[PDB]
Each structure stands twice: as structure tokens, then as C-alpha cells.
Structure 1
Amino acid sequence: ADVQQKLAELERQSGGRLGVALINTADNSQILYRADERFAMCSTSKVMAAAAVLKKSESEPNLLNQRVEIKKSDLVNYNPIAEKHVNGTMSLAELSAAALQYSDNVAMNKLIAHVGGPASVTAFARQLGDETFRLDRTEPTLNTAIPGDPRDTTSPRAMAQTLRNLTLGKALGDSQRAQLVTWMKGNTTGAASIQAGLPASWVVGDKTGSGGYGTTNDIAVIWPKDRAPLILVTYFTQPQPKAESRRDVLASAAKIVTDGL
């Protein structure tokens, strides 16, 4: 009751639309707020694309080592790693790390292409039991985040359940699950989001995202000190097309739902 009041208050103060799903694996409980509404995933969709590559790699031992050309024609609007490798190759492992840890959009496009495109990433989600996730577009257009548009969306509940499966459950084989967790724990982009609302000592693997309409997102697996892990999804979007990001709202949401733990 208190936690719900606090999230509603945060949403009202923020001026936007907030979606939260926490799974506490200590007691199999959840805290949900707009958790069945759709939100544009933006760069948080990179987790599903990397996971689809990892799944493919379970039957293809040379896949992660496969060399992918980086051409000028591959550049899109946010390319911090790929721009340093133009006219050379990167491995699919290197592209996965760049997508997850630096949120490189070229890297995301190569992951998408090498599993068969957005509909293939979506079919992977369906195979895991996630009916909600939909990846419709490639980078950079998947980040438009127009209100009412279902393209490139999921719900907080669906993404929390799927992230649990990927990182703590059995969607991926032992090697592949460990690799995803390693990659997410090495994320460099998330300190202002969920992590900013948790104690300094807690360990986090997360993936942020942002896009049109001031969309500001984070999805995380969290290891609190001496406690079972948590899964937290915080999605946020705003009414104005050119709204600025609100990473503080995600931090505030994280603090609200973990207070006590």
C-alpha cells in the first residue's frame, strides 16, 4: 500500500508515465506499477538481441568468433565503438559487448541482422514464453517512442519475467547465461539510473535506454548484500516529443521498491 502510494506520487511529480516491475527471488514476490502497459524499450531491447545471438551460439561454436565487417554504410547515429573499427571487422562477441556495455547502435544492428532480423528476435522471445515483447524495427528508428505506438514495445511485467529467465533461469545454457550476466555486470552506462537508487555496495547488471518523448529506461539484475537477487524494470516516458531524459525518476523508483531490502 505504502509502496504503491509512493510510486503514484513519483509518477505524478514526474509529469510522465511510469512502469515498474520488481521480482524478489527471496520470496517469489513482485511489486508492479502499470506493469501490463506497453512502453518503448529503446536500447533495453539490446539484451534480447544479445540473448538471441547467445542462444544461436549454443549449436554454433564458431558464432561468437565470426568476423563482421564495419562499413561506413553501417554507421547510424550513436556508434562509439563501431566508429573506431570502420573498414575492419569485429567479432560477434565484441559486437555483443559493445551493444550491452556502451550501447553502440551499429553493434545492435549487427546482432539483429545475424539472427535474422527483428522478427527473429521476436520469435526468440516467443520461444521463451514471452508473448508481449515485440521488436519491429532496427536502429536507429526503433527509438521513436511515439505515444500509442506499439512498435518496439514490451511491458514491465514481461521484461522482468524474461530478464529473470535469461540471467537467473534456464533460457540459456550455463556458459551463455554466465556470458550474458558478465556482459551486463560490465555495463558502463547505468550509474545514473537504477544503480543511483540502490546502496553503493549492491552489485548490478543492467541495460539502460532512452528515446523520443523523453523516454528513459533501465532493466537490471541486482544482488543486494547477503540477499537473494532481484530483477527490476523501470520504464518511463513523457508527453512532450522533445522532453529531456529523467534518469532521476528511475533512481527514485528503484529506491522506493527496494527500501527495506
Structure 2
Amino acid sequence: DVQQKLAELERQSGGRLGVALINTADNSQILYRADERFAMCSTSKVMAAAAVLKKSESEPNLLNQRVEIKKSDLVNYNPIAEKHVNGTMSLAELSAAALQYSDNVAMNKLIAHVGGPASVTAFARQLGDETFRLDRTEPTLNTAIPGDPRDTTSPRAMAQTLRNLTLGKALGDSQRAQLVTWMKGNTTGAASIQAGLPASWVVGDKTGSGGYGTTNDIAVIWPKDRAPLILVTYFTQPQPKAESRRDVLASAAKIVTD
């Protein structure tokens, strides 16, 4: 029944929908095109920030290390970094900016610190994720051309990895809580997965959008007096200049939580 609802939502939208939900109360999953590749876009910022968190486990004060911001660093979307031109920002400030305001400059500094996009992929292979891959920097990683395997993952792999990072033992206890704290304090996700959930629920999410009307959101949801949920909703359209469809993500969220 839930599978037929998710199918009808896709058919009526004319796009391609990717859903993976993990319920920790019974360890069950709800999957739709869960092994198909979808372009992550901005969502990829969770894996870049976590890579820096894992690095900081063995290097002392890393989130304190400062990084120079120049005007030539700036690209299409940098709401926080553009306030720091010819100043510095710590790796904590950049992590918080990438995750909570979706600053592409912050993400690029996080990518460059660990060694580049292939070095973020290497961090994903360390955790047991063999589908994730990062190839380019922001914003070119958002091109989301159908067929292109660059900067993609599957809904199943991301859901699994998100659980390991935010609830499981993939990072240290302090590092885990920090990511949770960052994702919970996001400002960008009110119209996406959150919109199809009850208002009172605590949510930590990372949104994303790009070419071909690609509309994305990955989330860990903590309902009061319940066990938490992990949800990945990835959507993409056939037309190159298609507008976003966040409402499809909210609708998919509702179908799978009630």
C-alpha cells in the first residue's frame, strides 16, 4: 500500500523519485528505487563535514584551525563566506555554514582541507559505503545530468551511512553529537521533508537542489516518545531547466511516516 502510494506520487509528478526510510523501533525499511543513482547535490555536505570530524578525532584542535576567505573564492551561493572576505573562518564555522545555510564556499573549503573530492570518497569507503562518490566541487557537482555517475549515491547507501554517522559508531561520541547538533540547527529544510511531518517533531536535515529540477533532502527524525527515523528523499525531472519540486519530498515524507 505504501509502495503503491509512492508509485502514484512519482507517476503524477513525471519525475524519478528515490526513497529510503529506516525505522529504528523495528529495524524495518521502506524502499523505492533505493539502489538507483541520484545526484546528491548540496546534500553531499554531510559527508564532507563528517570527514573533517573523523579527522579531528586524532588531530587536536582542528575545528579551531583558521582558513582564509578571498573574493575570488566566491561562487554562486555563499551567504556566510561573503561576510568574511579578507578574513578567516575556523573549520567549525565553515562546517556550521555548509550544513545550516548551505554555503558553497564553506563546502569547498571542507573539500579542500581533506585533500579534494576523491578524498571525501575515501572517507566514505572507510565507513563501509561503496556507492557514494564525490568528483567535483560546488557548484559544478549539482549538474545532475541524467545518466551521469559523477557526484551520486543511492537512497539506500545514504540512509545507511546517515544512521551510522548520527546514531551509530562511525564517528566518536563528541563528533557524533556535534553533527546531530549542526543538522538539527539547519535553516533551509522547512518546505521539504519537514513539511510532510507533524510540526512538533525534532528533525535534523540537509537539503539540495540542482540541474533538471533535482530536489533532495536527507534526514534523521526524532518523534517525541518514539525511536528515531532515517529518511532519504531524492527527486529529479526530465527537463534541463525544470523548477524544484520540494512538495514531492514533503508528500513522500507523509506517506512513509503515518
With the length of structure 1 as denominator, give the TM-score of the two structures: 0.98
Secondary structure of the residue aligned to 2:58 is: coil
Deviation at 1:127, TM superposition (A): 0.5
Deviation at 1:61, TM superposition (A): 1.6
CA distance in 2, matches of 1:23, 1:134: 22
Deviation at 1:233, TM superposition (A): 0.1
CA distance in 2, matches of 1:43, 1:224: 25
Deviation at 1:58, TM superposition (A): 0.3
Q: 1:1-261 to 2 correspondence within 5 Å?
A: 2-259=1-258
Deviation at 1:203, TM superposition (A): 0.4
Secondary structure of the residue aligned to 2:75 is: coil
CA distance in 1, matches of 2:225, 2:115: 41
Gaps spanning 5+ residues in structure 2: where? none
Secondary structure of the residue aligned to 1:162 is: helix
Secondary structure of the residue aligned to 1:221 is: strand
CA distance in 2, matches of 1:201, 1:225: 8
CA distance in 1, matches of 2:166, 2:73: 30
Deviation at 1:23, TM superposition (A): 0.2
Partner deviation per Cα, 1:127-179 (whole Å, 9 max, x = no partner): 00000000110111000000000000000000000000000000000000000
Secondary structure of the residue aligned to 1:213 is: helix
CA distance in 1, matches of 2:18, 2:158: 11
Secondary structure of the residue aligned to 1:195 is: helix
CA distance in 2, matches of 1:230, 1:183: 17
Deviation at 1:73, TM superposition (A): 1.5
CA distance in 2, matches of 1:212, 1:144: 5
Secondary structure of the residue aligned to 2:215 is: strand
CA distance in 1, matches of 2:177, 2:119: 23
Q: Number of residues paired by the alignment?
A: 258
CA distance in 1, matches of 2:233, 2:213: 14
CA distance in 2, matches of 1:246, 1:17: 11
Partner deviation per Cα, 1:220-258 (whole Å, 9 max, x = no partner): 000012110000000000000000000000000000000
Secondary structure of the residue aligned to 1:58 is: helix
CA distance in 2, matches of 1:134, 1:192: 27
Partner deviation per Cα, 1:176-235 (whole Å, 9 max, x = no partner): 000000000000000000000000111000000000000000000000121100000000
Percent identical pairs in the alignment equals 100
Secondary structure of the residue aligned to 2:108 is: helix
Deviation at 1:119, TM superposition (A): 0.5
With the length of structure 2 as denominator, give the TM-score of the two structures: 1.00
Q: Which runs of 4+ in 1 moved over 4 A?
A: none
Secondary structure of the residue aligned to 2:62 is: coil
Secondary structure of the residue aligned to 2:221 is: strand
CA distance in 1, matches of 2:8, 2:225: 30
Alignment root-mean-square deviation, CA? 0.4
CA distance in 1, matches of 2:114, 2:170: 16
CA distance in 2, matches of 1:25, 1:137: 34
Deviation at 1:72, TM superposition (A): 1.0
